[PDB]
Design a protein around this ligand. Structure first.
Ligand SMILES: Nc1ncnc2c1ncn2[C@@H]1O[C@H](COP(=O)(O)OP(=O)(O)OP(=O)(O)OP(=O)(O)OP(=O)(O)O)[C@@H](O)[C@H]1O
Ligand SMILES: Nc1ncnc2c1ncn2[C@@H]1O[C@H](COP(=O)(O)OP(=O)(O)OP(=O)(O)O)[C@@H](O)[C@H]1O
Ligand SMILES: [Mn+2]
Ligand SMILES: [Mn+2]
Ligand SMILES: [Mn+2]
Length: 292
């Protein structure tokens, strides 16, 4: 019943014309997909990107999430979440952890992978486009509690936990190749992506149409604005509030007939929206960085 958390990837290069990486490990004599256990304080996407680079030598950009594999181990239950990950280069060198890496088209990869669950991941990988662009919709971090004033406090800041959530979100959002930054017109939303702003040296665009008060006054304008942002070149991060996100996500998924595998709305959480030719093809809910 104790869960060991891990993450990994279908790492690919070049539609089933791509090649995917399959690794061999001499400790187990197995062929499998690269993956590994989360370190203290990592989230799954951070661990996936790190373990990809450690086991294959390649850097990569994560995209669509491809489901979860569990299996019993002496410690309890091993849990692996998998992402599609596009190689951004690197070179493999054999060692004692991983002694071989082969790049295979999907069909021959399916023959090489010994675990049925890995084959299931790879089937998911091919079901939808993999060369995707990415929108990251983030609910701001923890910011104490609303006062008894009607509606909303413009300037309430992140609390200490929330500031730490903001710092922890840099690595997670960098894992998906975030490039451009947007925040609803509340201090707490800006402060959530300010650490990422500093890392990228990028300015945070301000978004009055995406606050809770605006969504409630004019939801059509909020939806239009999301699409406008998503249509721009780059991979945008959009930080907004709890009353806004569920409605926007549900609307987009409905219209494009995308089924989210997980759902939630926690402060510090992230929705990874994968697009192919402007069409939504994945909506993946990630837990806040300090929650399970
Ligand atoms: N998809 C699957 N379904 C069922 N069983 C699977 C399986 N994959 C591996 N095993 C089987 O479980 C045992 C532990 O392997 P593991 O879960 O891959 O263990 P691990 O902790 O050695 O490997 P990672 O989780 O990949 O850990 P790291 O990369 O973090 O390890 P590191 O310390 O080498 O970095 C092995 O005998 C293996 O054949
Ligand atoms: N005074 C209030 N007026 C209206 N809604 C409130 C009020 N207080 C709490 N809520 C509701 O409860 C939720 C959580 O409020 P809390 O004070 O914990 O966080 P918050 O930082 O304001 O969150 P968000 O900015 O995501 O709405 C809000 O999203 C809102 O739906
Ligand atoms: Mn591993
Ligand atoms: Mn490893
Ligand atoms: Mn490891």
């Amino acid at each position: 019943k104790h869960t060991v958390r891990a993450a990994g990837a279908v790492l690919w290069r070049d539609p089933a014309t791509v090649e995917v990486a399959v690794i061999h490990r001499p400790r187990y004599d197995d062929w499998s997909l690269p993956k590994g256990k989360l370190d203290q304080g990592e989230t799954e996407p951070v661990a996936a990107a790190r373990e990809i680079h450690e086991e294959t030598g390649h850097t990569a950009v994560l995209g669509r999430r491809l489901g979860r594999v569990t299996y019993p181990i002496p410690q309890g239950t091993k849990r692996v979440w998998y992402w599609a990950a596009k190689s951004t280069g690197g070179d493999f060198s054999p060692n004692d952890e991983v002694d071989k890496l082969v790049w295979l088209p999907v069909d021959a990869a399916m023959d090489q992978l010994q675990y049925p669950d890995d084959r299931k991941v790879l089937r998911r990988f091919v079901k939808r486009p993999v060369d995707t662009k990415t929108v990251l919709v983030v609910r701001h971090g923890t910011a104490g509690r609303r006062s008894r004033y009607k509606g909303d406090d413009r300037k309430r800041p992140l609390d200490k936990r929330g500031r730490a959530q903001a710092e922890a979100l840099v690595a997670q959002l960098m894992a998906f190749g975030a490039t451009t930054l947007y925040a609803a017109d509340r201090v707490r939303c800006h402060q959530t992506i300010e650490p990422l702003a500093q890392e990228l040296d990028q300015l945070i665009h301000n978004e009055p149409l995406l606050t809770e008060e605006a969504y409630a006054a004019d939801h059509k304008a909020a939806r239009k604005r999301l699409l406008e942002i998503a249509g721009r070149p780059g991979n945008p991060v959009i930080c907004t509030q709890g009353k806004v996100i569920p409605g926007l996500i549900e609307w987009w998924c409905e219209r494009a007939k995308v089924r989210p595998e997980t759902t939630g709305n926690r402060k510090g959480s992230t929705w990874v929206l994968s697009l192919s030719d402007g069409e939504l093809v994945g909506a993946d809910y990630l837990s806040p960085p300090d929650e399970k």
